[PDB]
Amino acid sequence: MNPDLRRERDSASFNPELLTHILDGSPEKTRRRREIENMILNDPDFQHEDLNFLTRSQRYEVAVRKSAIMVKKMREFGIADPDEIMWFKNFVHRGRPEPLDLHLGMFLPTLLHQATAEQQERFFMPAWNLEIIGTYAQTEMGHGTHLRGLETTATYDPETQEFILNSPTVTSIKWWPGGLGKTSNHAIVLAQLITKGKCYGLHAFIVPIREIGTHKPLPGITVGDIGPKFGYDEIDNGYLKMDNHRIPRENMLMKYAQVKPDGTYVKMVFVRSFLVGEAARALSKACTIAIRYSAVRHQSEIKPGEPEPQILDFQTQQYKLFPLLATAYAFQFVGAYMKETYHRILPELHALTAGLKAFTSWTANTGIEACRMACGGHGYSHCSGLPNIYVNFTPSCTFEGENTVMMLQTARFLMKSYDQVHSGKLVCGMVSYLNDLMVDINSPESLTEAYKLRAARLVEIAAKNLQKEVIHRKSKEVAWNLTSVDLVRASEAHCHYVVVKLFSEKLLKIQDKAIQAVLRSLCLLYSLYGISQNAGDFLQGSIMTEPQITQVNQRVKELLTLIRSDAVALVDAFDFQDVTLGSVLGRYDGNVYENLFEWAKNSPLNK
Amino acid sequence: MNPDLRRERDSASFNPELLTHILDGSPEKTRRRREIENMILNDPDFQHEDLNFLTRSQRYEVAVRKSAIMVKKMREFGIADPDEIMWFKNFVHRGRPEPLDLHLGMFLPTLLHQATAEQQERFFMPAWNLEIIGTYAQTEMGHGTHLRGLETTATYDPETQEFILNSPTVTSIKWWPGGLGKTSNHAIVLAQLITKGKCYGLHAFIVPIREIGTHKPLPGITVGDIGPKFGYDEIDNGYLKMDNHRIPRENMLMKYAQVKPDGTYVKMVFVRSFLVGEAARALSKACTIAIRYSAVRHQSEIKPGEPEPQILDFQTQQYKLFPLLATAYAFQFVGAYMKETYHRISPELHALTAGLKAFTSWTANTGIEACRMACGGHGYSHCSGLPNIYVNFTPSCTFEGENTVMMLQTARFLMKSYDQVHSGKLVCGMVSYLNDLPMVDINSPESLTEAYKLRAARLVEIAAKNLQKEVIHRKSKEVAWNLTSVDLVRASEAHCHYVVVKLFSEKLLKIQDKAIQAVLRSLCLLYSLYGISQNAGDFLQGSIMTEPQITQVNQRVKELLTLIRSDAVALVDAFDFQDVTLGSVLGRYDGNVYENLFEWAKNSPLNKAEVH
């Protein structure tokens, strides 16, 4: 072990083992997760050349093969709990996305929960056996956010009792779906339903796209890879063009609506919750690499005659990393809170889940790159593992609701809540602070209240600005568009308050007093950093005075010093194995330099 | 031409051709640049497969080759003139870094400036035929920022009149230098000079590393590529392990220090300037792609049931992109001001270049990714060109002085300047605003510069006073510096922000064309007012502005977005990037995205077969 890391670990104020239990949810969840990862770690079937050394084609081949053996192995070892499947999937794929994600994550769940019994007979087992490989084709070249503008049609033919699936234009072609290019022989296709001569809107269809066995595209199917991307090298993100392709009537998903044989027409928070936890995980891994490597890397001078200190001793380096470390923990607890209240429980839930998806993904996105730039040159090399974490996490800000649009869906629920209050009614939950229309900087409860007042101020500015535009502009929709920057600021401040409140609240449930102490130092640093970084939002409305902002900035610098001796153990508690970080700089043992020279010598331009 | 791009172009308030002249410096520089680009455009020798469809080894092969053909062709056409060489190199390489950069920019220039006739006679002449290909090996796996901590040794042997170049440790190994991997047969190596007695600190040594013919590595020499990176696929960024390797004593560069045969020992600022222009250019390309694509892309609804509008009509899309286009222009004018100051030039220049290199590169870095995310899904595809612009620009924040270190140099200068003014002496230059230590008009660039001045003065004074407090507390200046370093970086940031607003504001008064001046005025006001909006706290404290003034700043930014909307396509056209320089289906001049996108994908590698 590198003696800087052993020393850092020996001087910690808390037992990281106990903090891993808190993050997993219980000691048994830690044991069960470690057992699953340790099932995989030395399995040769899950070993391969470093993926940064391979072509995109080879990376795709490696990932598809792993996803197959892994479906087989999970069944052999009888792993079947949804948490456990995800522990297994995560560790097999080492942070990379995996080509059966849509089959296992959308196609199979959709069959079990949205398909008819006769659809399940026909499709479910061949899908579970990977005889049928499925994807979900929603987005078109021309439309992703506005699904009402999707051009794909499903036209009912009563003479043959089929749906005719059509891509009438180049923009109409399905674009992005994972596994669509090369892997899948079936797709669930979102299409505008036309029956008689009327459109009834968006409905979902099971569409065979390739021959089972041969994998040849069916007549009237054009399908392929959309080409290389910033990341997702391992995923055959694909296009699908349908030329009036016919399917049985009975391939429509009729859970909420039906077409009769004569043509008559009768009348997710899970994934956004998962994405907050993925934001936590990605930022956590990035903080682990950069903080360990900051404890290993010596550079430059503080005391002029003295040896090069660890760069983590520089107040600037602390300022780059510790507020991210605090942010990581905060997001870990927001992700847990939302997972544990989705099973408990709605307009607020939808609004809250959209906003936190956007808030956590944006903030983690920026975090990861600040972590990479904090390592200096070696950060930029794939030896850091930080480029792959960035490029594979960043599309979280665009898919499953583009972040700006999500914040506007949040703002709609905040304006609805504002109008409810000013019309004399009462609102509930996280927006209950809208009913009410001097800070102690070492109190999480007191900073939560500061963040509450910031949100109420920005929500009232958005409402009033909106009210003036509604009175002045030619349409309410123009008024909305011309208030949209202020509506996003309101949704943002709302989300930031929710994160402070949830992290503050978690502290009271920590049983171990040493862990409660260091999490409180993270919760205070998160809250105080956010005030420092948004001072104007606390100064206006007189929520806080200039002297208090001075004291906020003094306390942030002290918290950096408090956190320094606990930083390594705090990232150690995330419990990422070296193979999950993919990082020479961030190895558990801190032996970077001998391993960097090996990695570099073995790399491809030296054959 | 896409009819949305035709309509926007036709209703522009100004002539983008005259703005290109302002950016290039004259109508003749524009014409000459375009001529060099257009002879490179029709040269079959500079043409290759889509770089996005190739492996890293193929990318490197395509690059070193275009770089060799490029040296030969610039001699043939007599392309001398630094501006012309830059225009030629920029266009051949299409935004990618160039694997002869260290050869042409550090090896040959160092031989011409520093080498004695003897050294120049046996080195610079075959180097000018590409028989010798050199590099400059400064950084080690263990040291980059702190050069004094370099571990490579050059020990003098008085007997055999040689230097011993040794790499004692794995950390000592030279690491990163462009060309060092595969390209170079020769390196200027930076080492600690030990002669008989002890060490006389950092000196340069000419170390041949590969044979001139076999290109085989010399005895004592271990050399290779450091592996794949976030970008720079085209560059064999390299390592160099020297095993007590022997070189003649006349291999030491001795323009300012010498070692006699008796072993007797006797006696980054142009680059930083250039990187400011690089920050400007990279941000400008990203704005070009995102603003054109935003004028082409229709999505979602304003009045429900009316046609889906161009996404550039959404205020949020305007707020992501117009502030960045205003920054791209600010940065073009800061780059030109640096170039113009350097040529002409009683220190401030070192401080100001460091701080402006860090300020601009950090801000451009953030802005390129914002442009990419503004394009939605298609942004993330290499079809957008934006992932490449970002990965090949981003190391600018790390190399040629790590940005935080550079802001800390700028802050040494600001603290010295502060102490000087508070001891009664007058400072000059961009810090002359400190001399003046003890209602803002938001339509006046001059009054907005003044606000920025007061913001900077406030944060400089806070850094200074916080530093004095820690000095008396800890009784160590170097420790008190560390414990103030976050405040000190904040003072340099605000200083550099002020300088940018000042220069943009002052550029507006030299614009001849009234219509151009009026729109650049709108960009300058948008830059200034967005910066206040984003930093309202730094203006609210010390009573520089009031809450009601921040309210009006916010109203005026919303107004300038609407005004800039009808000029935004023309403003990005005026950067005069060719399609092949942008490398972007989304950002093509003609706005024909969708049919071109489908062709691009259909021809991409995984569609060589239907079943993989």
Ligand SMILES: Cc1cc2nc3c(=O)[nH]c(=O)nc-3n(C[C@H](O)[C@H](O)[C@H](O)COP(=O)(O)OP(=O)(O)OC[C@H]3O[C@@H](n4cnc5c(N)ncnc54)[C@H](O)[C@@H]3O)c2cc1C
């Ligand atoms: C790696 C990756 C994997 C994907 N996987 C899948 C998949 O498996 N299946 C699939 O069907 N799709 C998939 N997608 C596509 C994804 O669903 C879309 O990218 C997403 O819906 C965003 O839509 P868009 O890309 O068309 O962006 P657009 O909707 O075109 O928007 C682009 C810009 O317009 C702005 N904008 C749009 N509407 C508004 C509005 N109403 N108000 C204000 N601003 C607005 C956005 O904020 C953004 O700034 C994937 C995408 C990626 C990048």
Ligand SMILES: Cc1cc2nc3c(=O)[nH]c(=O)nc-3n(C[C@H](O)[C@H](O)[C@H](O)COP(=O)(O)OP(=O)(O)OC[C@H]3O[C@@H](n4cnc5c(N)ncnc54)[C@H](O)[C@@H]3O)c2cc1C
């Ligand atoms: C793409 C690329 C190309 C390169 N090409 C070349 C090349 O051609 N030739 C060459 O010689 N080099 C090259 N380099 C290396 C480059 O010069 C170094 O990366 C740079 O000098 C930074 O030092 P470092 O990487 O050792 O980071 P470090 O110096 O180890 O710094 C890492 C961290 O420590 C912090 N830190 C360091 N010192 C201080 C301090 N005094 N105060 C506070 N914090 C501090 C930094 O802020 C940073 O966050 C290249 C690098 C890259 C990424």
